[PDB]
Amino acid sequence: AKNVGILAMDIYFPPTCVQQEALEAHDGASKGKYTIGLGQDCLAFCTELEDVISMSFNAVTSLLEKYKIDPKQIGRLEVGSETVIDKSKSIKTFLMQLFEKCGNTDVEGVDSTNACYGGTAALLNCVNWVESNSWDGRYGLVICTDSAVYAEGPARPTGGAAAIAMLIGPDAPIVFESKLRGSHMAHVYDFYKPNLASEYPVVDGKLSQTCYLMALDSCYKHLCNKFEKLEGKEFSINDADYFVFHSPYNKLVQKSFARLLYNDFLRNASSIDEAAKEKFTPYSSLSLDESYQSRDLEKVSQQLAKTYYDAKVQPTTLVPKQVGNMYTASLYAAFASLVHNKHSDLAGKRVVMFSYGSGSTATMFSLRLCENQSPFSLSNIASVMDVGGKLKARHEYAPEKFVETMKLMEHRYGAKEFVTSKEGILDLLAPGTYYLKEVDSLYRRFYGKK
Amino acid sequence: AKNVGILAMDIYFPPTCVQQEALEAHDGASKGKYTIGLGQDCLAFCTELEDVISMSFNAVTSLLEKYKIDPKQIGRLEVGSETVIDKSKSIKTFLMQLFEKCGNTDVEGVDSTNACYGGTAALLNCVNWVESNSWDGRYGLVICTDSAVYAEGPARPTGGAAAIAMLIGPDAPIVFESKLRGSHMAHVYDFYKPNLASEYPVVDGKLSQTCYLMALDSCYKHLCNKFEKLEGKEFSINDADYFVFHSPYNKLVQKSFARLLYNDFLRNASSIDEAAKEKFTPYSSLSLDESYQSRDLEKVSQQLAKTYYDAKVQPTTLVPKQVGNMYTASLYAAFASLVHNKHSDLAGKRVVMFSYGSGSTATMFSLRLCENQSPFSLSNIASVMDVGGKLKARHEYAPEKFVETMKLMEHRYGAKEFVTSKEGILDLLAPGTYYLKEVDSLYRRFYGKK
């Protein structure tokens, strides 16, 4: 099995959303604290009618149909997520509802967990499966599904929701560079979910971004080393046409790419000109911990990175800026954002991917894109995903109705025996959407279509 | 990479346990309803001092040391479990505590979830990784960790706890037969954990065993077909020296193997003599659903299987009968049970493995064992594991103290800010054991050694 990677992808996000300007107004935020300070435009959320299972059915059904793939042809199916509705019954078993109709039950894989990183873990597990002595010749399919929610406080504005499906196989338009990658894994308490009964994480910020950066530095050094072995030169920011990052909120995407540039300094690589060396050297006396901590160093770094960031990163930002944190699916939404904007320039390019998950699991990895027959082509993928069309099928909420909805969802998380109220909501969803109809007194879940 | 499978394994279970006879007395069970009816001897449980993390540290530390493997040499590390203490921070990140001392943080893998089946999923993911274009030449390491507990009622007697570690690599004494295997996956509600705040599952029994059997039938047919392709004959119970099953309780191990024999009937294979054909044919008029449901068919099947079961299955039962349900680790405890009893006869044999997890994820798969240099040898593995020694280092509790303990554990599951009471318990654990010292008010966990 050769040139294995991503053959096809498709995305779903709830059409229901709230505008960030409007929300600054609703909280008492200073003007542009969400739109500029966080970097965010719009925030998509599950109502009572939607969840990570219904979203997942939407993405799978949609990939299958539109790419003309038939369901007997899926031989591995894995789900990444951190949104747990059941502590033992995996989302993967729910998806099996879709395969029971054609009698394909010989299908490997379960759910992968770790924070905004489980999807990546799954997609690796799938690449490895196509390449393995146990491969039965069929496609793998990976789902990234999640629903990001915070309590009332300052972290609410960073929520989002989405499912993403990827079809995995040989002779792909999006090929893994097998050896080009670095991971960092650690034991930290930057972001976690110790409240069994709550939908909401416990989140430190004085580690949140520290640990993202600690991990990014380390995955970056490890990819650098592998590159010097493989290609005979030091890696710098010039050696890839694009960097795509986990996108909890856009501000952090900016900082992260800036940080790559600052790392290129540290190593004297060939993307740090005479004048950057000048601007940076004020800071070479910082301890490592000091370098994570310096608001001056950030400013300097972001400022140096701005034109590089327009060529290498801005086109990866559409979806994240318009939907919000997608946890496991966030990186892969940024990647779809890049296929949508730049697919005609991508043939023959190198896209570098950085995945992250708090508690601390992370992998930077590399992809070589190329030319290939429909349906498994960069253009065809941009066409099926239809990002533009979907951004246009949205339905705005006043920050007040958003709040009420958040309250409702707080009441149904981990609850049993209710029927979902459809009035005025069902009509808001695309024909053919899967929606939660009810939860019985034994917590069993029941889903509708159309 | 050739002849990849399991290079080394080691096991841990809490020394603290309660006797089944004694427990029949304590509940008002009829005599031998646990010892004969369930098939169980003894039941191991976590006190406040222990959990799936501390257990996991015990197995890893113990594998590393005793097999003289150094920690920089682990390049993939994955955990299977269904015991969630955090909804986003994986047990894998906690294990990273052990690797931070030698600075090895480039280590792939997260947790795999689905019920008594996540460990299997991990170990497959690891086999596939050694065989993949992305393999960096290092060992994989898989952990199965869990702590089985039920509420008061009839299911309490089936609890257990254990961690198991497996080292994965090429040129193994325990080699995967890459193509010889079948999975069945489905959407069912036989056993699940919808109570976010509870340690205890919701469990149906009129599906519990139905679904185990539905899945076993189906994984069996799929392995059969792959065998007819590969070896040119119909598979029957004679074509393997051993069948090792997921072992929630021993009664079900008996039924399951009986069922294989009944399936061998259905297909007229070469292990159903003239007289079995006679005894079975009363039942060939049953619907499929009828065949899962018939207490007469069971009796007949178990009875036909008894001498085959003594040769092919009894030696896999030591640990499960003495420790209890180990969920993800249960199958791999049964396998250790088989290495302990029969290691001198195993060189050149075929051991067939059946893994299961409710909600419905399952895989039957096949292993070819053989002769190989220490430390990676069947004899050396039987020596390091030291099952006998460990069974002897136990510490009995009166069913009354067991109950009190269960009550305590109910109070600490999902709780914060306590210090664990060590009096009279710490002294009960082996020198070098990892134990929970305290949980702070932000739910962060802190572990001791010795």
Ligand SMILES: CC(=O)SCCNC(=O)CCNC(=O)[C@H](O)C(C)(C)COP(=O)(O)OP(=O)(O)OC[C@H]1O[C@@H](n2cnc3c(N)ncnc32)[C@H](O)[C@@H]1OP(=O)(O)O
């Ligand atoms: C999810 C992951 O995989 S890792 C990332 C962390 N994890 C998360 O889940 C994010 C959850 N979110 C959070 O915890 C919070 O939203 C935080 C910490 C990101 C937000 O921080 P807060 O304490 O709300 O406000 P803070 O004062 O830090 O402001 C945020 C940013 O907006 C800037 N800002 C504030 N007001 C304005 C304004 N009116 N105009 C422009 N910028 C503004 C701040 O200066 C800061 O930006 P900078 O970093 O560019 O200086």
Ligand SMILES: CC(=O)SCCNC(=O)CCNC(=O)[C@H](O)C(C)(C)COP(=O)(O)OP(=O)(O)OC[C@H]1O[C@@H](n2cnc3c(N)ncnc32)[C@H](O)[C@@H]1OP(=O)(O)O
């Ligand atoms: C965990 C998994 O991966 S799948 C397996 C199901 N899952 C679990 O988690 C198991 C949890 N356990 C349970 O739900 C329960 O312990 C059950 C359903 C297994 C036990 O059943 P109960 O309703 O307690 O009692 P039941 O009357 O069914 O008795 C159990 C067995 O003991 C037999 N029995 C009862 N009393 C006696 C006795 N005194 N002597 C000998 N046998 C007895 C019963 O006949 C039955 O055995 P059989 O199947 O050989 O006929």
